[PDB]
Write a protein that binds this DNA or RNA. Structure first.
Ligand SMILES: [Mg+2]
Ligand SMILES: [Mg+2]
Ligand SMILES: [Mg+2]
Ligand SMILES: [Mg+2]
Ligand SMILES: [Mg+2]
Ligand SMILES: [Mg+2]
Ligand SMILES: [Mg+2]
Ligand SMILES: [Mg+2]
Ligand SMILES: [Mg+2]
Ligand SMILES: [Mg+2]
Ligand SMILES: [Mg+2]
Ligand SMILES: [Mg+2]
Ligand SMILES: [Mg+2]
Length: 47
RNA sequence: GGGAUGAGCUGUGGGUAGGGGUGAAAGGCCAAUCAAACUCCGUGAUAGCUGGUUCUCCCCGAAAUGCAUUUAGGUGCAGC
């Protein structure tokens, strides 16, 4: 009853990771680290 | 300082247009840009390259080696 009583099951929904938002999280390279290809592009699986 | 009746200078009007013109030839000039003008479009071209990437705390925590490579400042797999 009463729409203000519905809550999702625990573990069903978890917040997305925002990756370029300061030093306390994935800071500036956003997990990329490198200076090479992988810092700006993807490497094809076939290469 | 050079020429200053000459292969002179100059006005007005016109013509040659981009891998094309024009050049007593320097790759010179073609609207302050020229070893291929400019504008718009393809187009948010591509760049193994440079730069940038924004709030917090808790736990753990490297590598800079091997192999191969049109490879050596890149990448794949292993190692961590
Ligand atoms: Mg910073
Ligand atoms: Mg990562
Ligand atoms: Mg890398
Ligand atoms: Mg490096
Ligand atoms: Mg950087
Ligand atoms: Mg593909
Ligand atoms: Mg004319
Ligand atoms: Mg020459
Ligand atoms: Mg000019
Ligand atoms: Mg041209
Ligand atoms: Mg060309
Ligand atoms: Mg296209
Ligand atoms: Mg520790």
């Amino acid at each position: 009853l009463k729409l203000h009583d519905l809550r999702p099951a625990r573990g069903s929904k978890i917040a997305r990771t925002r990756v370029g938002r300061g030093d306390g999280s994935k800071g500036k390279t956003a997990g990329r680290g490198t200076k090479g290809t992988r810092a700006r592009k993807q490497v094809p699986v076939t290469f």
